Design a binder for this molecule. Structure first.
Ligand SMILES: Nc1ncnc2c1ncn2[C@@H]1O[C@H](COP(=O)(O)OP(=O)(O)OP(=O)(O)O)[C@@H](O)[C@H]1O
Ligand SMILES: O[C@H]1CCCN[C@@H]1CCCn1cnc2c(Cl)c(Cl)ccc21
Ligand SMILES: O[C@H]1CCCN[C@@H]1CCCn1cnc2c(Cl)c(Cl)ccc21
Ligand SMILES: [Mg+2]
Ligand SMILES: [Mg+2]
Ligand SMILES: [Zn+2]
Ligand SMILES: [Zn+2]
Lengths: 482, 483
């Protein structure tokens, strides 16, 4: 494949997603086809996350994709700048609808009137619901596959609680799971943090987040969000119960909402991706081991080359390794090597006739590319061991890049000095909005925006330190971002 | 506590139980309904099974855009003039009218087939077998019900493209037997397989296959699943061509199938097994198979009443039985008795205070009202035995309730008599379209062609004449009232 990754990041990414068979383009701009190689990743992420939130009592469901005209701005759910991102159905066939229907850009306007009818007492809480679904956002700044699409797949959770304490607990549990996804499955290191006033979801009380860093572009990307909504929506959609113990006080529910999208797949491509194609974290690669015969003129033993391949396959499916034998004879073995490497398969297993009656095979890992040979009997054992060092390696190496590329700055000239080195940086920060619109202006003369306030900043903020001016309220992570 | 009796008022009875079993909730937009977890659970079980089966025949899951361009939807003869009012069109983004109307997927052929054309550049690239679970909008043609006919629904869409007709035609009937499996092995609804007539099959295809279940209470059958052989109709329009390996420089157009199954299943299972005190759920699809409920309401030993339920719970989770202890205090056992019966849980497990010191408990079945009593120490043995026999009941009772209402008519003489007591009937039928618009007008709200059954109730013989009487009969056709 043509591109490097230092070079022109976009075109490299354009080619890796297309030539690894993950994405296909579509007539309608900003929409993309998820071919099975990519969709499988989403399924693995969804299978992990789904097991997780059922242990916390969340149940899956499905809500309509359509929201009323009346219902959508019946309440101050979103801010005025969100109106342009809403797609409207105007016509059915060619008979104009009496009233425009909107395609859900998020489900809050669709679920919360249901919560209000379901909740008529203390018994009815908590409500913890999840749905995996598609949402369209006519996203104004320009799209690229995965990172920012115009239709995309996500799960969105909405839970309603009677007491504050339970809500604030579920906000961080969900956030730790998101971090689990990025770090246990995708091998991406993340920073947990809270949004500022400029960047928090206006209709809530506070917004939690994880932030990943793409060194090649030098930008951070927010990989997931968990809101504590308090009762802003409770009192607006009138989700009230009366407790007979506390006679005669309207009790509003405490609500959270949380979401995680296919931008996850884009982040894993960008950070682990090389100039030989994709690189797949083993615990997410739909195929972890591809079996190939090579040898790297005779007749009857070529079906015995292929009968041993399907034995290799079956024996490790009994060890629950996901495996595909590539028994196509149409292609040179060398061609399949490039082919499955551009798709980033972690382990290639070569079995040749002169190595077969050696009672063995060679394995090549996609991480480093070195070759080893391990007992035919010792296959279950050793191949699964190799898949795990592949994962810890890709976590470690991407960890080393985030570790190197995140540093502390205390003044503005050297926050600017190190930010134009393509690194993200934590600064003492006021926290107020106008101080922040300014930082991003004075860093163009794109600009650096608030990524988050890390729960665990890199250094303690000392008493009386100021940001630019008012004194500094916390160390916040700043940087250029998607 | 439920209002309607099915016998009395079918529409209201159906509206009453789907809400009060907490399966669906209504919504501002007509024909749209929220699937609460109790319904979505049924759907997920179906999908965990169907996905397992069609993966063994090599289909792969994927996701295609929901928006279809004007050009592509009206590109070729995919649909007909009838089929373009049911399509929802997005025209504006915010207050900015879009240059070109975007249409919301009523099916995905027009999204996928441009993609097959680029993926297929030789016969090595075939077959292509893709499935997607997704939502579909059809702003359709009469007043709606939850499940049975909605305006957005969930389904799976299978699309396969082949080099030879033999392989394609093979997959159309493989798929259909899976649909029959879900309806029959999972849902305990017996079905009849069939082919559509020329009016009723998918116009853009060559022949389209179907399963039909029968709901007695209204007297109507329902189309429960769909498998089309498309021939080279679409390959020729969307130009899915490959080079022939033997004939230098000649295109072969691909052979295509498409098959689909919708959440309309859950509705028909509501209609079929639902009784007059609410739903009945076949156990291998019931998200919870056992409800444990304490009964009898001193504290120090009622704490041993609630701890004994939780050993059953743990004991039955070790047999991979899905079980719920409902140990809530804010509700009386009678209220739970009701609550879970309207949700159709197969086995209710009541424990009353001296049955703990008897080393007993009582088990109640959801179909019959049966009660047994079994020793504490039996965990594996008896509860699974009843969980599996409950399923055999729901199947047969609906099976012979199909053998009830599906009878032979060879003449009209009794066919209209044989149609309108809540009957479905096979007739000798011409095969041509207007004898059928006639049969349905001579019945009235008409008797429609449901399908042409594979494997009918009696063999036909030469020179038999249709109900039309003019032209002779090419096959026995399944007729009846139908949604
Ligand atoms: N257009 C999009 N394509 C893909 N993922 C998206 C898109 N918009 C948002 N996301 C993801 O959805 C998650 C929850 O959505 P959210 O409502 O927080 O979006 P947002 O804050 O408007 O996004 P952003 O700040 O990136 O513009 C985020 O963690 C983000 O990663
Ligand atoms: O962060 C997610 C997690 C999942 C639940 N919902 C919040 C909503 C974010 C709030 N939010 C973001 N973009 C929005 C648009 Cl475009 C509209 Cl119209 C309305 C609201 C919008
Ligand atoms: O059985 C499914 C499986 C997936 C492929 N398509 C067929 C039926 C399409 C045939 N088909 C049925 N209803 C349709 C409407 Cl409303 C429109 Cl607009 C267009 C086509 C329609
Ligand atoms: Mg946005
Ligand atoms: Mg944001
Ligand atoms: Zn400041
Ligand atoms: Zn006729």
């Amino acid at each position: 494949l043509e591109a490097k990754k230092e070079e022109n990041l976009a075109d490299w990414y354009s080619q890796v997603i297309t030539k690894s068979e993950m994405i296909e383009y579509h007539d309608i701009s900003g929409c993309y086809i998820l071919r099975p190689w990519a969709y499988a990743i989403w399924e693995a992420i969804k299978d992990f996350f789904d097991a997780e939130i059922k242990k916390l009592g969340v149940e899956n469901c499905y809500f309509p994709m359509f929201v009323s005209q009346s219902a959508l701005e019946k309440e101050k759910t979103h801010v005025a700048d969100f109106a342009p991102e809403v797609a409207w159905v105007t016509r059915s066939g060619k008979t104009e609808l009496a009233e425009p229907i909107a395609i859900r850009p998020t489900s809050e306007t669709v679920m919360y009137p249901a919560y209000a009818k379901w909740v008529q007492s203390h018994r009815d809480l908590p409500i913890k619901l999840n749905q995996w679904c598609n949402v369209v956002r006519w996203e104004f700044k320009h799209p690229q596959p995965f990172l920012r699409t115009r239709e995309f797949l996500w799960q969105e959770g909405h839970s309603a609680f009677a007491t504050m304490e339970e809500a604030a607990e579920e906000v961080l549990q969900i956030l730790d799971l998101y971090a689990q996804v990025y770090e246990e499955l995708l091998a991406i290191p993340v920073v947990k943090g809270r949004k500022t006033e400029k960047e928090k979801f206006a209709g809530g009380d506070y917004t939690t987040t994880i932030e990943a860093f793409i060194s090649a572009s030098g930008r951070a990307i927010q990989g997931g969000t968990s809101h504590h909504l308090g009762q802003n929506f409770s009192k607006m959609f009138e989700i009230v119960f009366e407790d007979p113990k506390i006679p005669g006080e309207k009790q509003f529910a405490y609500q959270n909402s949380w979401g995680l999208t296919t931008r996850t797949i884009g982040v894993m491509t960008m950070v682990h991706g090389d100039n030989m194609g994709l690189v797949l974290p083993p615990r997410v690669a739909c195929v972890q081991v591809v079996i190939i015969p090579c040898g790297i003129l005779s007749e009857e033993d070529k079906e015995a080359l292929i009968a041993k391949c399907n034995d290799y396959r079956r024996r490790l499916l009994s060890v629950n390794i996901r495996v595909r034998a590539d028994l196509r004879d149409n292609y040179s073995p060398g061609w399949k090597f490039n082919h499955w490497e551009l798709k980033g398969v972690p382990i290639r297993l070569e079995v040749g006739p002169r190595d077969m009656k050696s009672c063995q095979f060679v394995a090549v890992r996609r991480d480093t590319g070195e070759k080893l040979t391990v007992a035919e009997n010792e296959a279950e054992t050793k191949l699964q061991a190799i898949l795990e060092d592949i994962q810890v390696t890709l976590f470690t190496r991407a960890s080393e890049d985030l570790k190197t590329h995140m540093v502390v700055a205390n003044t503005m000239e050297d926050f600017q000095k190190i930010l134009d080195s393509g690194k993200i940086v934590q600064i003492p920060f006021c926290g107020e909005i106008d101080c922040e619109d300014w930082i991003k202006k004075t860093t163009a003369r794109m600009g650096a925006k608030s990524l988050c306030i890390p729960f665990k900043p890199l250094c303690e903020l000392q008493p009386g330190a100021k940001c630019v001016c008012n004194p500094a309220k916390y160390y916040t992570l700043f940087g250029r971002s998607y």
